[PDB]
Amino acid sequence: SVLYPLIQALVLFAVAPLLSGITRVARARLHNRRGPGVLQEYRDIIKLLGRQSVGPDASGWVFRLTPYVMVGVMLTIATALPVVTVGSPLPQLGDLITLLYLFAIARFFFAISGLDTGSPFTAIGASREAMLGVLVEPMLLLGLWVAAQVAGSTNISNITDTVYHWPLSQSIPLVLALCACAFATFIEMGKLQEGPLSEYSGSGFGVMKWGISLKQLVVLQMFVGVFIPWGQMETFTAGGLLLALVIAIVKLVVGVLVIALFENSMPRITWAGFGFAFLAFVSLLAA
């Protein structure tokens, strides 16, 4: 009961800068330049791990200790998201409220780290990130809540195999909730200069880049593994594993490509994300 979640967390950690690298090379190719390689994010992260972390005199243990906390919280997230089966490796932790409030832990620690430094830019970025979390958390909660009451249980691996076997009788509540979750993922992976990491340096900046890449992995993974499960397993076997890894990495790659495309193709989607979420909620109530 230990090996599968641990290997899940380790692989999802070690594949995260592929998704950042493919996103930045996609943004480079979209702006008609050759751009860096897909492994450039690994080179940047390892090189920053080589460098030594500096900070202000007023900064204490929070400034140094935040990036490890955010990486560990993203790991505790990623160990309960199903990427190859329809069953989560840890069904005890794989709830809906648990994942949301662990993301709240990540937001809280990022905000207090931004406020720990005396820089106005980091505190401003902390406030904007906390605003983003306030506006995105109930959208995604209502999306997976509509999907959960379609399913019957407040639990990942129940919503996933409910949408795996499409019932064809409550299809409109499923589709509207799916599009609301897509909008919430679009808001979280994007906005919807100086930056909020202008005081981080060295190993701390490297572990922040680790955490940012892992957060961008797990948000898209919570979308495409919970709501796109056709290609996974009901029970874990040792022969159909390669197909599951192939379809998982293909899903993640096409997800970051299309999100980069529609990000460069740009409170409309903020209201429409709420609007498609309530259109899902009314759909069960009317029907």
Binding site: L30, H31, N32, R33, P120, Q193, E194, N264, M266
Partner: protein
């Protein structure tokens, strides 16, 4: 002779104040008025006669007439001539009445003269240090000809900045958002203090002159006549030919120098070619804050083919060196001239398609309207000159009022909009690209011919004049007095954005934080041209 009517009006309004008057050229005029009656004369010529306070500066004439000289250059634009108001400030007690309580455009020239020459305009409200850094010792006045050697460097008094920023509308609860001096995409040092309450800017003060080299003193000590054309090119990389033509025409107007026929309007060709380079850079930066980046890289592309004619008409990138006092250094040949003609045309092809972005009109309708509004009431008072004042409604243009390098043989069109937004100043620069491309279309096909250089002349000492050019950001007025056959007695340059800077408080007021770098870049600042 131009300027007789204004002199007669000054004489009838003030009977015995004009102590002496002389003509530099036909359209250039200077008057020496009484010191105690100075603010009334300049205010009269400003408000009543419709004159614009172009540049005002001090001088060190204590071994010529025993007195300091403060000049007040006014541009008559209601025919159109230049009037300079000269006063003789006393030597051992340097004090003259100030103009800033009457003319608001006299707020930084009278702050610069407090620092460079130590003269004291009595009644000046803004008494803070402007050009000299915060570690500068007090009484060392650099531009005094006997205060110090150009090579002397005082010990810095403080390592921390001691500048005081005023908060006109805010209070002690407002926070500040720096935007300098070390900021990304600013690419040039200048500090800003956005006294913000949220993301809204309540007030905005700024500290400038971080790039104050001190080339006014160095142009009169170590450096000659033909060598200052290299100093003017190395002020900023994009107004280089604007400063050089402004300086060259100041020295050729100080003497006769009947320059050859084609050597005038080739300078008119290269002056417009440079504003292809500078406007299309600002329009690329206009898309990098409005939003699209595939509108920037593409304006970088049409900027490159503007750099391609600059590669062939000179053979250089950025700082060049093509003008001398008598004429132009390197000379254009036939195919270069036939060629530049359709690369001008294909740009008008490319520029039309790329300008289809504002036709798209999504972030160019909500981010660029109602943002950074410059009051034409305020722009008239502070005498802004760039696309700022042309957007605000005033048709201020040097090439139409005062044709300097043979612009009268070129098709001149002045474009003035009515709105005062960021998108209105882009429409000034869009219509100026087509206007400059019409001159390249009509300049290089009908060259008059003749020689290129007039050399061997002797510089008459203590002869001065005003030189002016139409830079991409406004006009640069260059005043240079010949000292002898080798050195200059005094050279004064005012940048295009020097007049433009004191109204940034009234643009950034009421706007947001996020579009504040767009407001600053809407007028396309050249910190290195104004910091000198």
């Amino acid at each position: 002779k131009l300027g007789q009517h204004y002199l007669a009006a000054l004489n009838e309004a003030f009977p015995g104040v004009v102590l002496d008057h002389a003509w530099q050229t036909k359209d250039q005029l200077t008057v020496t008025v009484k010191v105690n009656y100075l603010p009334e004369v300049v205010e009269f010529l400003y408000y009543k006669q419709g004159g614009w306070l172009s540049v005002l500066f001090g001088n060190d004439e204590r071994k010529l007439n025993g007195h300091y000289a403060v000049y007040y250059v006014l541009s008559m634009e209601k025919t159109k001539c230049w009037i300079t108001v000269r006063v003789e400030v006393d030597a051992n007690k340097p004090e003259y009445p100030s103009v800033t309580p009457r003319v608001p455009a006299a707020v930084w020239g009278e702050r610069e003269v407090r620092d460079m020459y130590g003269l004291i305009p009595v009644g000046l409200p803004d008494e803070r240090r402007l050009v000299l850094p915060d570690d500068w010792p007090d009484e060392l006045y650099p531009l005094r000809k006997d205060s110090m050697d150009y090579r002397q460097r005082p010990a810095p008094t403080t390592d921390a900045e001691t500048y005081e920023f005023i908060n006109e509308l805010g209070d002690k609860k407002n926070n500040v958002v720096p935007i300098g001096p070390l900021h990304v995409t600013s690419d040039e040092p200048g500090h800003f203090r956005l006294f913000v309450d949220g993301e809204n800017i309540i007030d905005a003060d700024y500290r400038l002159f971080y790039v104050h080299r001190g080339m006014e003193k160095l142009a009169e000590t170590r450096m000659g006549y033909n060598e200052v054309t290299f100093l003017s090119d190395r002020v900023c990389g994009i107004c280089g030919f604007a400063h050089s033509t402004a300086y060259t025409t100041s020295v050729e107007n100080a003497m006769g120098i009947q320059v050859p026929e084609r050597a005038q309007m080739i300078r008119a060709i290269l002056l417009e070619v440079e504003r292809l380079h500078s406007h299309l850079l600002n329009l690329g930066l206009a898309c990098h804050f409005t939003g699209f980046d595939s509108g920037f890289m593409q304006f970088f592309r049409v900027r490159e083919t503007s750099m391609k004619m600059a590669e062939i008409l000179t053979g250089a990138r950025k700082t060049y060196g093509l003008n001398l006092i008598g004429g132009i250094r390197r000379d254009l040949l036939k195919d270069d001239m036939i060629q530049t003609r359709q690369l001008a045309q294909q740009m008008r092809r490319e520029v039309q398609e790329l300008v289809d972005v504002l036709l798209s009109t999504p972030n160019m309708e909500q981010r660029t309207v109602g943002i950074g509004r410059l009051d034409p009431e305020i722009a008239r008072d502070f005498s802004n000159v760039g696309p700022m004042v042309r957007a605000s409604g005033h048709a201020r243009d040097t090439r139409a009022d005062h044709p300097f390098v043979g612009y009268g043989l070129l098709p001149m069109e002045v474009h003035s909009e009515q709105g005062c937004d960021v998108i209105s100043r882009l429409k000034v620069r869009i219509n100026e690209v087509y206007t400059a491309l019409n001159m390249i279309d009509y300049g290089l096909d009908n060259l008059p011919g003749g020689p290129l250089m007039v050399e061997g002349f002797t510089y008459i000492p203590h002869r001065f004049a005003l030189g002016f050019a139409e830079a991409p950001r406004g006009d640069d007025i260059h005043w240079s007095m010949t000292g002898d056959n080798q050195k200059l007695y005094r050279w004064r340059c005012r940048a295009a954005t020097y007049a433009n800077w004191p109204t940034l408080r009234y643009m950034l007021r009421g706007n947001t934080v996020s579009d504040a770098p767009l407001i600053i870049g809407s007028l396309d600042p050249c910190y290195s041209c104004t910091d000198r």
